Amino acid sequence: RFSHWVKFRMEESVFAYMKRRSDMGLSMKMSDEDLPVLKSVLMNNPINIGIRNGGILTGYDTENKVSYDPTIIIPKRANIPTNDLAARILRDVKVELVYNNSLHYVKIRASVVLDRPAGQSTNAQTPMSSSAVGV
Amino acid sequence: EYQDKVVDVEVSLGTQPIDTVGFETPMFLAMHGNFPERIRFYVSTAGMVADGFAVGSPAYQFATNAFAGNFAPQRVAIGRMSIDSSKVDFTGTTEQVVVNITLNKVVKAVKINTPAQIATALADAVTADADLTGKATAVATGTYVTVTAVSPNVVSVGKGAGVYKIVNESSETVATVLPSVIAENHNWYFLATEARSDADIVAAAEFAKANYKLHIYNSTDVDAYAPENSAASVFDTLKSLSYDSLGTSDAGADVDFTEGSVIGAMAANDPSYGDSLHLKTMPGMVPFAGSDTQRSNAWSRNANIYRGLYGGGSYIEGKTSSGQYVDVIRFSHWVKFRMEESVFAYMKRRSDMGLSMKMSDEDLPVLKSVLMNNPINIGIRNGGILTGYDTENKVSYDPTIIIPKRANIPTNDLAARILRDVKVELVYNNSLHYVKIRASVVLDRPAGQSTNAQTPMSSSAVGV
Amino acid sequence: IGAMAANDPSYGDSLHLKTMPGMVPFAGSDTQRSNAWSRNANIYRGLYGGGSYIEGKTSSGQYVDVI
Amino acid sequence: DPTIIIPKRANIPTNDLAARILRDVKVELVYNNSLHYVKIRASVVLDRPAGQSTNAQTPM
Amino acid sequence: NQSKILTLQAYDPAKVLVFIGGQRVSGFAADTKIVITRNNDNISVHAGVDGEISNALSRDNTGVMTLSLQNTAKWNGYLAQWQRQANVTGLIYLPVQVEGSQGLSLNTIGWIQKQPDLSYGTEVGQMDWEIGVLDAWLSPDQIQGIAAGITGLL
Amino acid sequence: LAQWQRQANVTGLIYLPVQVEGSQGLSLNTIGWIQKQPDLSYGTEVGQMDWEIGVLDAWLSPDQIQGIAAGITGLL
Amino acid sequence: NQSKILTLQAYDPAKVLVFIGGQRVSGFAADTKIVITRNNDNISVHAGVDGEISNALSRDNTGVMTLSLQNTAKWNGYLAQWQRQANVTGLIYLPVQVEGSQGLSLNTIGWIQKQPDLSYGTEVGQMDWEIGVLDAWLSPDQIQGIAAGITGLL
Amino acid sequence: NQSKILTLQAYDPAKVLVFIGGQRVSGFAADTKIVITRNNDNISVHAGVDGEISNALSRDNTGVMTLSLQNTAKWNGYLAQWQRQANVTGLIYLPVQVEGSQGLSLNTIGWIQKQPDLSYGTEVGQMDWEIGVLDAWLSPDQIQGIAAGITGLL
Amino acid sequence: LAQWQRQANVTGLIYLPVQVEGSQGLSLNTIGWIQKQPDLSYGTEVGQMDWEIGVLDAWLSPDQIQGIAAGITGLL
Asked: Which domain of life is it from (chain C) (predicted)?
């Protein structure tokens, strides 16, 4: 459902911007001075509503040392093959996302004590991270 | 993979978990045949017994003593040597004798009720068990019973009840075995041995100094506190060689192998604090019973003694064979290991992205920050490393680091691509061991004090 | 090759001490390591919880970086 | 610094002129050195360190 | 050591693109086009008498984006009309985007905070509009990212 | 620095070592952090950014033959 | 002696979590989020004429937890509706939980004691709700516990 | 985590409507228009010596609604005349209604409690009328209602 | 202190020694107890807590050369 939602609404948002931009004249043109606005257009609607409602994840990963920030890339005019300038269609726009996750199952470990619990260790040192012995 | 309940709970009655701590795993070189590997790691005595170890056996005693300390580790390494036979010596006196013996996964507890007669009765009882006879053997001689396993069978013998010794004999020598043991795993710090002959102890001490390990041994000898002129014990033997090994006299060292208690009072102690062993309590050990002169002799021979004071038990003086405190040795080893590990970790990360380090004045100085991170700063924060200005000598204790410049590096090293002459300095702190007080009591009216109100002058002016 | 393919030679970066997934730490002893080094047979050690190639020497003794 | 040297025409042999190929262009470079090994010398003091030398001159 | 060129291309002011609501702004002033400043410090420091130091992060990311336009530029009318339109209807937010030529960029939501003063004189006047920004974090658009996992220490 | 700012903001680790080597003057070696991001301005010429980096201790230490005279100036 | 950093991480106000009834509160004020205060002194002291000193413990653990929210926050409606719901049905108690970032925490039962005043002005207003707590004992969530058996003396 | 805008629209003070008797009030002061405060705490607490806690609800909902008007405003005359009209005829009650822009609202009966002091000076003076309210329960006018049946616990 | 508060509340032992050493002033050495726990407030900056500790005797004692003149000021 999330994939279908993204697929539909990114397209609807882009088409709605393009139609409004071409309904006043001044239709969009294939140049480096006008293409980058697609970044803001896409960051509006789905990419931001998803973050606000919690569907899209953000932040820095501590395990893999990677960031989940959404990314958008737009090619430049010099990289567009001549054929597409005749077909007047742009390609190779890339977007990335990280989906959140619900919680389905939980497992607990309880414990019960009957007699007097045994005295705990009285070490006050700050626990060391790992053994020093390594070659 | 499939869970039938959205929420499940395992109710464990009585038991509790324990957190994961960082520690140094000790190694106990025992002689047996329970597994083929030279060295294995266990996390509890339950696993050791599940591997065919007999309750009360040397390794079992060492493990159960080690796991009971305030700083006990969570893994124990058990070495393996060859085994020829075992002895159960009844020299001494004893009413009920119980010996736990396990043979090829078969567990039995022979029973018996002058030492020679007890030994003969035990030997006869062992042969009564058909299972033991088929797979094991027993013979009586003097005050001890010798038991040997039939070749395709593994026998483990351990203490039950009563007074007696358990001694295992093996042809393999420690000097020959340790080089093979270290090859399988170098991931251990403490060294202990089951064999208690003088030659084995000397070999272990020589090996430890070469391979940067800490050696521990309990001697159970009586000459340990003989008059100072009697230089005939192992303790005095090690002094002549200037070796380092934490040795202490005891009475149960050959029935319980109390090295476990010391290791458990040492394993999880971070050297960065400089926390000496002076008064640390250790379960399992028994107080030293000699008088004052015996204690003086033991101190003169550097044989540590466990003493009971004001109802408790306490180690004393933590001294090593060479005379240097064990705390200093541990601190030196800690610095030596962790400076190297930090530098290597920085270098590897720097060369894993490309842009490996190069020998130039524009890149070398970063070693100052690299070293000031990790040991040099953790030591200051935890109090192990001293800082400040000395008022007596008029010198500062601030740590210092020096790095040579490219122009001073000989051409040969630029071909060998190895840098030398990096220098570091440090000042170690000190714990408090002994205190002496001077009290005074007054009975009558104290005499009136001098009524001088002048500021006390520093020194006499008369000087030429 | 995968630990070296995209490395740009112009930085002069070193193959020493890099991590190479797929291989396994070498299990020889100290003398075995010394012998292998005497033969210029590079090994893959495991230290401080990871792995690391060592010195990337070529057969003729010259460092691979210079080549 | 890198050095580049190119011969003049006067130094080109007749056979080289006939074959229309130029020889003996010489280049010279220096190379950096990644760091492999490092050694340290720590020192620990237990008692009070003694006073240092007080010769506050400029070392010759 | 030889001097190094810090970049291959040349910083071209015309390549800096400002998109307010989906349209490119034109008719900028002479010296400075846009200035971005944070309202508050990133991290505060609390110093005790004994010398203990503790710090707390700041979650106030609001900022101000100055915008200079010639009084003859047509965009003055657009902003002026939008001001009253937002005042009446009640909707003030609109997307803001900035593309750097050889520097950092910005892409957040913003609003008009203050209308600049108008002065008529011998020469053409200038107007410095102030546009608020919900978040004033300048983001990179370069090969940066492979080294951020290297500077990390302690 | 810009990426590290957000990385520290998310993960919560802000401290990192700082070191300065003087040519013919004092030096510095302590821990530090990013306190404020400088303003950005685009104009006719190349702009400048003045980052502010905090320091736990701001004691400038010497790296010279100094040390043999500090035990001489002492008086009273 | 060198200055020491009192913590490894940085005190982040966003990490402080308040759970009232099982839902996270959002839309806090500017300066202070929550304040917790005890109503009465822990221990009383009785001093005699001769100088004899005797003390008695206090069993009154009731406290007040101030809570500041912007008047535009949606949580104002939730609390307002719950006030009347409790007034009608008669159930006023609900769980309260606070998680500290680098400090103490709290987990007890609480109730709404007083509704803050509402004021409309040029800027966005603020409302300081007061939430009672059955017990106002701030509990730790740190490695503390191995030293409490050391300070003990006499 | 990114900063979130707490609302879509902007809090507009002009959108706050006050209806006293069916007519809109106009000519407010500079800083604050109206302030609403409850006279008494919602819930009282009785704490025993042993520590037992019991609470009793409060049924006193009377409150005070401050109202600031410029002394030049025409509404000063209306209230002044109504004061004497009520004093003579004996009818003092009249409906009171307040509509919030992005906050809570109020709709109850009220009366004039105290006439503010009058002062003439260099600048235009201010008068802060006090209007009583039978019930001072601020009610919401939002999507609130679907979550009040969620926070409930214990 | 928080844990000790509850420990004393349960077990019933509240007293513990208190000692203060002055740098260039008076000192103090008596018995004390925790009287009131300070309020806790979370805000933009790091908060502060002002614990109140009772003292059996609040007589500030000197640790100086004082003592040779106290037998001089005496008069009448």
From this structure: Viruses
The number of beta carbons lying within 10 Å of the beta carbon of residue I67 is 9
Beta carbons of D42 and B332 less than 8 Å apart: yes
H/E stretch holding B248 reads strand B246-248
User: Which residues lie below 8 Å from residue A34, measured CB to CB, with a gap of 6+?
Assistant: A28, E24
Helix, strand and coil in chain E, % to nearest 5? 10, 35, 50
Return all residues near I52 (Cβ < 8 A) that are at least 6 apart. I34, I35, I36, I38
Asked if A52 and H4 come within 8 Å (Cβ–Cβ), the reply is yes
Closest C-alpha to G61, from G42, G35, G46, G45: G42
Residue spans of beta strands (DSSP E) within A1-135: 71-73, 94-96, 106-112
Distance CA(E133)–CA(E96), nearest Å, equals 8
C-beta atoms of B359 and D32 within 8 A: yes
Contact G120 H150 (CB under 8 A): no
> CA of A17, closest CA in chain E: separation in Å?
9
Mutate to test the interface with E, among B346, B349, B360 (most CBs of E within 10 A): B349
Question: Could you tell me which of I1, F41, G92, E146 has the C-alpha nearest to residue H152?
Answer: G92
What subunits make at least 3 CB pairs under 8 angstroms with B? A, C, D, E, F, G, I
Which chain E residue's Cα is nearest to G30?
E60
Q: Are E97 and E106 in contact (CB under 8 A)?
A: yes
Q: How far is CA A102 from CA A39, A130, B6, H146, in A?
A: 29, 34, 14, 22
- B358 contacts D34 by C-beta, under 8 angstroms: yes
**Resolution of the structure, angstroms:** 12.7
A98, burial (CB in 10 Å: exposed 0-12, middle 13-18, buried 19+)? middle
Taking an 8 Å cut-off on Cβ atoms, the answer to whether B388 and G4 are in contact is no
D53 lies within 8 A of chain B by CB: no
Residue of E30, E130, E116, E126 whose CA lies nearest to E70: E126
Output DSSP code: residue E108. Answer: E
Q: By C-alpha distance, which of H122, H23, H119 is closest to H74?
A: H23
Pairing assessment for the beta strands B246-248 and B214-218 based on DSSP bridges:
parallel
Per-residue b or e along H55-76, where b marks 16 or more CB atoms closer than 10 Å to that residue's CB: beeeeebebbbbbbbbeebebb
What span, in angstroms and rounded, lies between the C-alpha atoms of D59 and I68?
A: 53
At residue E106, the 3 state secondary structure works out as strand
Reference F62, options F50, F70, F73; nearest CA is F70
The two structure tokens encoding residue I8: 């004393």
- Whether residue B149 contacts residue B105, with contact meaning beta carbons closer than 8 Å, is answered with no
In whole angstroms, give the CA distance from residue B96 to residue B121: 12
3-state SS string for chain I: CHHHHHHHHHHCCCCEEEEECCCCCCEEEEEEEEEECCCEEEECCCCCCCCEEEECCCCCECCCCCCCCCCCCCCC
Q: Give the type of residue at B333.
A: H
Any bridge partners for residue B31, and if so which?
A: B81
Distance CA A87, CA A79 (A): 15
**What is d(CA C45, CA B403) in angstroms, rounded to the nearest whole number?**
28
Tokens representing E72 are: 């003859």
Q: Residue G39: what residue type?
A: N
Please enumerate in sequence order all residues whose Cβ is within 8 A of that of B262, keeping only pairs 6 or more positions apart, or say none. Answer: B216, B246, B248, B282
**Nearest residue to C11 (alpha-carbon basis) of B353, B451, G131, B408:** B353
* Helix and strand numbers, DSSP H then E, in chain A: 4, 3
Q: Do B351 and D42 touch (CB under 8 A)?
A: no
The answer to whether E92 faces chain H, any CB pair under 8 Å, is: yes
Only one residue has tokens 């203990």, namely E52
